[PDB]
């Protein structure tokens, strides 16, 4: 099952205020109109960065696991929100064959009707997390539109990640190094974007 990722997957590349300027930047983004895998805890890889989009009505998805083996062999990232606080641990946890939620440690931190988008990337040992929450009224697939994901969590994990899994519909994307032209309004937010590798019209615009 695959759905159409029209114009979503765009986040703020840095913490720099830009106003009334069209800025060209090069970073890892989800391609426009690309195929994203549609799910209704499979093993998924972490090749170059993963865009995560989930639609919730009763808070089914609780968190994610990041690592390479995730079988108590090396350090693995455990980000679990148990309905009251977000808990992040990077211990070498021993995971079950089918982890699910019912109804050596170096770092530890404790904090359809809705759409929750997430971007996970690990560059130079730093885990960058971008997110954006918005209300929706749609069931079949992701809504068509544009939105920007702000950074909230920066983890200096220093841990190699090659495989992730989702703990509990959601969509999985992938990021590739393509150039983007970002439109900044007077308030410093991103209102539109152009994928420079989409079509020759987008190439001309870039």
């Amino acid at each position: 099952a695959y759905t159409n990722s029209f114009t979503r997957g765009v986040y703020y590349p840095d913490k720099v205020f830009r106003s009334s300027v069209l800025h060209s930047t090069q970073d890892l983004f989800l391609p426009f109109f690309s195929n994203v895998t549609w799910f209704h805890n499979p093993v998924l890889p972490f090749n170059d960065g993963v865009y995560f989009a989930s639609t919730e009505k009763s808070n089914i998805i609780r968190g994610w696991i990041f690592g390479t083996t995730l079988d108590s062999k090396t350090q693995s990232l455990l980000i679990v929100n148990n309905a009251t606080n977000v808990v992040i641990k990077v211990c070498e946890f021993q995971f079950c064959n089918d982890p699910f939620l019912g109804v050596n440690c170096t770092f530890e931190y404790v904090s359809f009707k809705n759409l929750r988008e997430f971007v996970f990337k690990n560059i130079d040992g730093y885990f960058k997390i971008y997110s954006k929450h918005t209300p929706i009224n749609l069931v079949r697939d992701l809504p068509q539109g544009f939105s920007a994901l702000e950074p909230l969590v920066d983890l200096p994990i220093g841990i190699n990640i090659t495989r992730f899994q989702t703990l509990l519909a959601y969509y999985v994307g992938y990021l590739q190094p393509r150039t983007f032209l970002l439109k900044y309004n007077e308030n410093g937010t991103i209102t539109d974007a152009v994928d420079c590798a989409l079509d020759p019209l987008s190439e001309t615009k870039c």
Binding site: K15, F17, G188
Partner: protein
């Protein structure tokens, strides 16, 4: 952190020899760090003899407050040496003057004046059209100050 005798405190050093450095706490020859020790004759030593500290099969040390300086128990903590950085002291901020400012990520010379910009909560610096810094956010007070270049 360990408790050793006063005479054996000198054995906690790179390239050192002795019973402690041979069988209890061995240090690397190219070790990087600091060694801090202090006397604990009024804390760990006992009148009847505090034999709770053992060293190498193992023998206990007769720590007493009536003993000598070399026989007094000493608490030694060795800090072996990125997430653990040193502290950064900040200074007062003066506005409307040509100053050499030093913020979190950038340095420069300019005049800091009150701005009317509306930064996003996650944004720390502002940029102009020509890729130059025009406004920054103060790391202590959540305010935005324009950087006017000096005349």
């Amino acid at each position: 952190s360990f408790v050793i005798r006063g005479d054996e405190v000198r054995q906690i050093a790179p390239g050192q020899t002795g019973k402690i450095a041979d069988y209890n706490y061995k240090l690397p020859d190219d070790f990087t760090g600091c060694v801090i020790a202090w006397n604990s004759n009024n804390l760990d030593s006992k009148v009847g003899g505090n034999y709770n500290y053992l060293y190498r099969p193992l023998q206990s040390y007769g720590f007493q407050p009536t003993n000598g300086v070399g026989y007094q128990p000493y608490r030694v903590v060795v800090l072996s040496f990125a997430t653990v950085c040193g502290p950064k002291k900040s200074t007062n901020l003066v506005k409307n003057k040509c100053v050499n400012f030093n913020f979190n990520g950038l340095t420069g010379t300019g005049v800091l004046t009150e701005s009317n910009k509306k930064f996003l909560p996650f944004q720390q610096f502002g940029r102009d059209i020509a890729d130059t810094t025009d406004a920054v956010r103060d790391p202590q007070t959540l305010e935005i100050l324009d950087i006017t270049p000096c005349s």
